[PDB]
Design a protein around this ligand. Structure first.
Ligand SMILES: N[C@H](CCC[C@H](N)C(=O)O)C(=O)O
Lengths: 324, 323
């Protein structure tokens, strides 16, 4: 008796999910659904199944982990899957989360299924820690920083600059801000104080380096609001040292107890592989959704509705004896 | 609206009284003390003798037990749980299983709900050890307790022959902490993680100071750690040793299929450890109040409670704001 997992999308996250399932003995991968031509990419990939045959697996999959891919169904297809399976997704558009929740709720309830929306590290683990911080310390301030990581949007922006062959951008928490937040003194940080941006650019022959540096730094919407540093490197260095697969971040609650005592709570992540970590979170939550589906839970839920006990394959007794 | 009863008025109890003030949806019904019935520390309103506990039946929604002990909780916990929903911070890890069993039986029978062992450890740290373990199944977990008193160890030394009074501190070792955060994974010996520093006020009848170091060779408590012992006067202790600050770290260093280094960390830096525990107890009382109203009965731990239950905000407000 194993939890039967199904993966939709075989991009970085889908591949990571397949790997993560290998680290979970209570789980088994039933199929990986892709839009790609199976006849083109197959032979031993027994698990690969064309997306058109997804409906044929509504009895073989307990939880469908939605790893979109990078198309469009990364927003409108989950509702399609929810109508036929219990789902788990990492919908990361914070501003549109309330909308996605409503749509997924109506659909999952209608189909008698349960859908977990917006899990991963952010949304997900960071969300949980923001909630925990303001709940434990109602009087104080919450600060979320997103550790060194790439902003695809900004990398595309860099490439539009005259004289730029190729390049990459990173957003990085400023140590000074982290130190201040971590101390007891509560304060509100300006955009410019929380994060800085570092770019690594490969210039075209000639180009005018100083002009590129300024074109990027004064770029509105992307860099204008942040202290930005531009490093000029070769194409070789770019491929070698900027795969851009790592990330991290910090969630800090700086509060005061009645009396002015400084109380600080911090949660952070340092991920060599952002995608694989997100996949691991997705798989852990699949165990939770499975348990909940079996209890008869219907509708959409978020990480905020799920007790951590559901994330473990161990029994309640074992947890209270080992970890509490 | 949520009616809270505070049981015990030591540091945690005092902290709960203040923390309740930081929560609009809560009200303090009374503070129950075991101080002599005849004359208390100023019988003024708030304080009420423990004998009157029974009279508050149906006027108190949650009884927060602030009787920092555990041994006392073994018996006092069940007694209260048979009359009210309860929340405690039972901190003896080894005996948590027994405590849970007893409180569960009692609360179930009385139709109440009892949250046991919340606080920062057990409690918050417990939640993060579980989280780390679930998200990164292949890896190692390391818990460190920042510089602060280790209460029990203070009592432990107060048991040494010739010790009038004293205090001990546990201090993480920077080296182990850095390694843990490195994501390399590696077992540590108790001695590699923390060191212990004691400050003892000798009951110097002329008592042997060198023998006072029974502390160092003391099984469990010390000996497994490099322990330093400083002798001082009750005057020095009282003024320079108000071991109120504390903290800790819970680090999970793992690898995902393929060898990618993934590190998760949760830590606390508390100027007032007791008041922080007090805040944790109050937030969880809100969750217990809600669970009770839903019909939940029996014993629960922080591992069974969704984080949304800790907030007075609506599920929609949380999703729109924090998700
Ligand atoms: N006191 C708790 C947690 C110990 C955690 C500790 N073993 C570590 O993670 O380093 C227990 O024994 O159940």
């Amino acid at each position: 008796s194993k939890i039967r997992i199904g993966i939709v999308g075989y991009g970085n996250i889908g591949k990571g999910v397949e790997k993560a399932i290998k680290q979970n003995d209570d789980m088994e991968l039933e199929a990986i659904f892709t839009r790609r031509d199976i006849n083109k990419v197959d032979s031993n990939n027994s698990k690969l199944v064309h997306i058109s045959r997804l409906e044929l697996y509504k009895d073989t999959v307990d939880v469908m982990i939605l790893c979109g891919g990078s198309a469009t169904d990364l927003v409108e297809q989950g509702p399609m899957i929810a109508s036929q399976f219990n789902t788990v997704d990492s919908f990361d558009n914070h501003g549109r989360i309330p909308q996605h929740f409503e749509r997924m709720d109506e659909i999952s309830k209608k189909a008698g299924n349960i859908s977990l929306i917006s899990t991963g590290w952010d949304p997900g683990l960071f969300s949980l820690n923001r909630l925990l911080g303001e709940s434990i310390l109602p009087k104080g301030k919450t600060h979320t920083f997103w550790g060194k990581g790439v902003s695809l949007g900004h990398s595309d922006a860099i490439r539009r600059v005259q004289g730029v062959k190729n390049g990459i951008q990173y957003i990085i928490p400023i140590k000074g801000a982290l130190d201040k937040a971590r101390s007891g003194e509560q304060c509100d940080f300006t955009t410019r104080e929380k994060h800085e941006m570092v770019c690594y650019v490969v210039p075209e022959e000639n180009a005018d380096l100083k002009k590129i540096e300024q074109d990027i730094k004064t770029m509105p919407d992307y860099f204008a609001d942040y202290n930005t540093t531009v490093h000029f490197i070769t194409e070789e260095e770019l491929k070698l040292n900027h795969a851009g697969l790592s990330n991290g971040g910090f969630v800090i609650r700086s509060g005061n107890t009645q009396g002015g005592a400084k109380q600080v709570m911090e949660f952070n992540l340092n991920l060599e592989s952002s995608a694989e970590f997100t996949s691991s979170v997705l798989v852990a939550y699949s165990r939770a959704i499975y348990k909940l589906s079996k209890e008869g839970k219907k509708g959409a839920v978020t990480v905020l509705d799920i007790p951590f006990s559901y994330l473990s394959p161990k029994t309640p007794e074992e947890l209270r004896k080992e970890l509490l």
